[PDB]
Amino acid sequence: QQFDFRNSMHMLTSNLTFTVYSDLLAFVSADTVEPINAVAFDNMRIMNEL
Amino acid sequence: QQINLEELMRTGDYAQITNMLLNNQPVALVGALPFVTDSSVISLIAKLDA
């Protein structure tokens, strides 16, 4: 093929400046009550024989 | 209004308090508590207590 400039010159649509994140989750801050205080769907208290 | 502290540190706080504090709304707290005495009026005008 012969070469024709015009037709080979294309413009470019590119976004600009990301920052890609993996793992995710991590951003989650989470603690836990003290075991002696649990509950199931029940809501009364899992493990309740003092 | 009110919010039992005992049940708070038990339940795990639902940002209920977190929100009210953030948004500034008239509220109360309840239970055992450490008082702290001050003098030099100043402190007051400066409104330290907030």
Torsions phi, psi of B4, nearest 5? -60, 125
* Residues of chain A that touch chain B, judged by Cβ-Cβ distance less than 8 Å: 31, 33, 37
Method of determination is: cryo-EM
Please judge whether B10 and A37 are an interchain contact, meaning their C-beta atoms are less than 8 angstroms apart: yes
Nearest to B15 by CA among B3, B32, B28: B3
CB < 8 Å & 24+ apart, contacts of B42-47? none
Report helix, strand or coil for B30.
strand
Q: H or E segment at B6?
A: helix B5-11
